[PDB]
Design an enzyme around this catalytic site. Structure first.
Site, mmCIF file in Angstrom:
data_model
loop_
_atom_site.group_PDB
_atom_site.id
_atom_site.type_symbol
_atom_site.label_atom_id
_atom_site.label_comp_id
_atom_site.label_asym_id
_atom_site.label_seq_id
_atom_site.Cartn_x
_atom_site.Cartn_y
_atom_site.Cartn_z
ATOM 1 N N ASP A 82 1.118 -1.614 -3.520
ATOM 2 C CA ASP A 82 0.448 -2.000 -4.552
ATOM 3 C C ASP A 82 1.236 -2.555 -5.622
ATOM 4 O O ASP A 82 1.929 -1.385 -6.364
ATOM 5 C CB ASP A 82 -0.726 -0.927 -4.965
ATOM 6 N N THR A 83 1.378 -3.802 -5.992
ATOM 7 C CA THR A 83 1.912 -4.031 -7.479
ATOM 8 C C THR A 83 1.090 -4.105 -8.511
ATOM 9 O O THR A 83 -0.268 -4.295 -8.330
ATOM 10 C CB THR A 83 2.765 -5.616 -7.414
ATOM 11 N N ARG A 110 -7.604 -12.588 3.404
ATOM 12 C CA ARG A 110 -6.081 -12.942 3.276
ATOM 13 C C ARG A 110 -5.510 -12.206 4.432
ATOM 14 O O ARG A 110 -5.805 -11.203 4.855
ATOM 15 C CB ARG A 110 -5.618 -11.733 1.852
ATOM 16 N N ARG A 150 -1.558 -10.894 1.816
ATOM 17 C CA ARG A 150 -1.472 -9.657 0.851
ATOM 18 C C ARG A 150 -0.627 -8.639 1.678
ATOM 19 O O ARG A 150 -0.846 -8.630 2.956
ATOM 20 C CB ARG A 150 -2.950 -9.081 0.681
ATOM 21 N N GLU A 185 -0.975 -5.755 -11.758
ATOM 22 C CA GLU A 185 -1.675 -6.845 -11.796
ATOM 23 C C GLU A 185 -0.835 -7.629 -12.865
ATOM 24 O O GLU A 185 -0.155 -6.971 -13.577
ATOM 25 C CB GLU A 185 -3.080 -6.894 -12.128
ATOM 26 N N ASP A 241 2.240 -8.930 -5.160
ATOM 27 C CA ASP A 241 1.947 -8.442 -3.747
ATOM 28 C C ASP A 241 1.289 -9.639 -2.845
ATOM 29 O O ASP A 241 0.558 -9.185 -1.887
ATOM 30 C CB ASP A 241 1.226 -7.050 -3.526
HETATM 31 C C1 LIG Z 1 -3.419 -4.101 1.059
HETATM 32 C C2 LIG Z 1 -4.814 -4.111 1.414
HETATM 33 C C3 LIG Z 1 -6.167 -4.383 0.631
HETATM 34 N N1 LIG Z 1 -7.192 -4.460 1.074
HETATM 35 C C4 LIG Z 1 -8.425 -4.620 0.294
HETATM 36 C C5 LIG Z 1 -8.779 -3.075 -0.358
HETATM 37 C C6 LIG Z 1 -9.037 -3.447 -2.022
HETATM 38 O O1 LIG Z 1 -10.444 -3.617 -1.833
HETATM 39 P P1 LIG Z 1 -11.276 -4.023 -3.295
HETATM 40 O O2 LIG Z 1 -10.829 -5.227 -3.887
HETATM 41 O O3 LIG Z 1 -12.642 -3.810 -2.878
HETATM 42 O O4 LIG Z 1 -10.449 -2.814 -4.455
HETATM 43 C C7 LIG Z 1 -8.365 -4.569 -2.235
HETATM 44 C C8 LIG Z 1 -7.104 -4.201 -3.023
HETATM 45 O O5 LIG Z 1 -6.296 -5.573 -3.138
HETATM 46 P P2 LIG Z 1 -5.431 -5.849 -4.347
HETATM 47 O O6 LIG Z 1 -4.623 -4.853 -4.650
HETATM 48 O O7 LIG Z 1 -4.872 -7.175 -4.063
HETATM 49 O O8 LIG Z 1 -6.613 -6.085 -5.436
HETATM 50 O O9 LIG Z 1 -7.758 -5.236 -0.842
HETATM 51 C C9 LIG Z 1 -7.382 -4.082 2.547
HETATM 52 O O10 LIG Z 1 -8.641 -4.010 2.917
HETATM 53 N N2 LIG Z 1 -6.694 -3.818 3.304
HETATM 54 C C10 LIG Z 1 -5.058 -3.628 2.945
HETATM 55 O O11 LIG Z 1 -4.206 -3.475 3.658
HETATM 56 CA CA LIG Z 2 -2.176 -5.417 -6.774
#
Ligand SMILES: Cc1cn([C@H]2C[C@H](OP(=O)(O)O)[C@@H](COP(=O)(O)O)O2)c(=O)[nH]c1=O
Ligand SMILES: [Ca+2]
Length: 129
Positions: A34-35, A75, A29, A37, A15
């Site tokens: 959510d994919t 991102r 991102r 890891e 993702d």
């Molecule tokens: C998809 C997305 C993720 N995020 C943040 C939330 C999550 O915070 P945390 O890192 O504190 O869990 C993290 C999840 O991304 P990843 O799934 O790439 O890890 O990215 C956003 O803030 N907005 C979004 O739209």
């Molecule tokens: Ca992910």
């Protein structure tokens, strides 16, 4: 919403991808998904699917939603298209991502993606298998 140009720089995982947007490198991102890891189940399959879809595309486009365009990590948050086909949707339709991270004001394609998730689940595909 509007599609804007970008080019692939490098695949990253299911993702996230590194694209050049307005001539700057950025990790994007994918919104609303959510994919797993890479280290998780179906993680390798999701990374492969996104890498292939991006690398095979003659045209990559970024579509920002109405709300935040970058997350707390710097991102870019967008819907990403490969030759007109949304990668976010395609992952969910294949059962390689779940609809996730649906924040108010960046959720224009929520219902499109939930419909794709229902079909993937009905087919018992991948994550739903
Ligand atoms: C998809 C997305 C993720 N995020 C943040 C939330 C999550 O915070 P945390 O890192 O504190 O869990 C993290 C999840 O991304 P990843 O799934 O790439 O890890 O990215 C956003 O803030 N907005 C979004 O739209
Ligand atoms: Ca992910």
């Amino acid at each position: 919403l509007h599609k804007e140009p970008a080019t692939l720089i490098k695949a990253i995982d299911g993702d996230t991808s590194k694209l050049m947007y307005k001539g700057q490198p950025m990790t994007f991102r994918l919104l609303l998904v959510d994919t797993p890891e890479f280290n998780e189940k179906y993680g390798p399959e999701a990374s492969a699917f996104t890498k292939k879809m991006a690398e095979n595309a003659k045209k990559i486009e970024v579509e920002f939603d109405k709300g935040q365009r970058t997350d707390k990590y710097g991102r870019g948050l967008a819907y990403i298209y490969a030759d007109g086909k949304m990668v976010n949707e395609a992952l969910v339709r294949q059962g390689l991502a779940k609809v996730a991270y649906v924040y108010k004001g960046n959720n224009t394609h929520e219902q499109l993606l939930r419909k794709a998730e229902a079909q993937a689940k009905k087919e018992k595909l991948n994550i739903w298998s």
